[PDB]
């Protein structure tokens, strides 16, 4: 995030970190939508131009996090992936159309002050709120600057 | 270049002609863009590493947070005249539901 600020504690309890196991590094952000399901961008998992094609075993999801690099004992929960599902019509070739993927977790994650799912919109919420000038909030541990 | 802790930014949804006119890429209905214009003064954007994260809005109707977007792509980060693109979660919710219902 560029020109953002530090999150408050528990400000984004659905935020999930996608974490590469071997070379340990941040891969991408993601979101918690129930005790077993995590939503992300398809291109985080499958993007041939960048030689990305992760399998379940290549990664972990880390939930309840605040610190980027620190292991947050008693706060964050680290979960393993059962199954990755990429939209079958995800367009990695042209424009990233339908850039969406779901990840099922092996065990359910326990909710806490720091871990809690976000709602998905219904037609009416989407119709009312997705209007020019209306503001949303983006969160992540990505770069603070382009270079 | 990297943050110590989770970063947050609030960004306005942009008119669809303005999103389309900012880029050579073909925009689809499954995408929307957000960010400030050069005239607007305020700045901010997602960047690499932020992808897959949520674009959320707090409903004024029921005080709940809804995930309207997924951080998807941008050309650079926080460049004037450029905007961040986000996956339109509602337009893909039938797929979401189908997969969960297994």
């Amino acid at each position: 995030i560029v020109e953002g600020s530090d999150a408050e504690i528990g400000m984004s309890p659905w935020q999930v970190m996608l974490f590469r196991k071997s070379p340990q590094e941040l891969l991408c952000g993601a979101s918690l939508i129930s005790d077993r399901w995590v939503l992300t961008a398809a291109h985080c998992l499958l993007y041939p131009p960048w030689d990305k094609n992760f399998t379940e075993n290549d990664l972990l999801v880390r939930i309840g996090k605040h610190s980027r690099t620190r292991y947050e004992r008693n706060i964050e929960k680290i979960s393993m992936l059962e199954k990755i599902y990429i939209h079958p019509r995800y367009n990695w070739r042209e424009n990233l159309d339908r850039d969406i993927a779901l990840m099922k977790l092996k065990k359910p994650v326990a909710f806490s002050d720091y871990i809690h799912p976000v709602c998905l919109p219904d037609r009416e919420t989407a119709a009312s709120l997705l209007q020019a000038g209306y503001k949303g909030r983006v969160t992540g541990w990505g770069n603070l600057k382009e270079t | 270049g990297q943050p110590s802790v989770l970063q947050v930014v609030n960004l306005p949804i942009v008119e669809r002609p303005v999103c389309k006119d900012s880029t050579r890429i073909r925009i689809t209905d499954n995408m929307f863009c957000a960010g400030y214009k050069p005239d607007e003064g305020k700045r901010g954007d997602a960047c690499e590493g932020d992808s897959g994260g949520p674009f959320v809005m707090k409903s004024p109707f029921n005080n709940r947070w809804y995930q309207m977007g997924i951080v998807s792509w941008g050309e650079g980060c926080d460049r004037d005249g450029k905007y961040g693109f986000y996956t339109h979660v509602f337009r893909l919710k039938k797929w979401i539901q189908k997969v969960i219902d297994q």
Binding site: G10, M11, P13, F111, H116, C119, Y134, G136 | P60, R64
Partner: peptide, 27 residues
């Protein structure tokens, strides 16, 4: 569902420092 209500904010009727900026934009 209990979705989208944050234990440290909505659940305690505490507001975070910038959520009012979102509300004010929903004209």
């Amino acid at each position: 569902a209990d979705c989208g209500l944050r234990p440290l904010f909505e659940k305690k009727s505490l507001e975070d420092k910038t959520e009012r900026e979102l509300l004010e934009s929903y004209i």
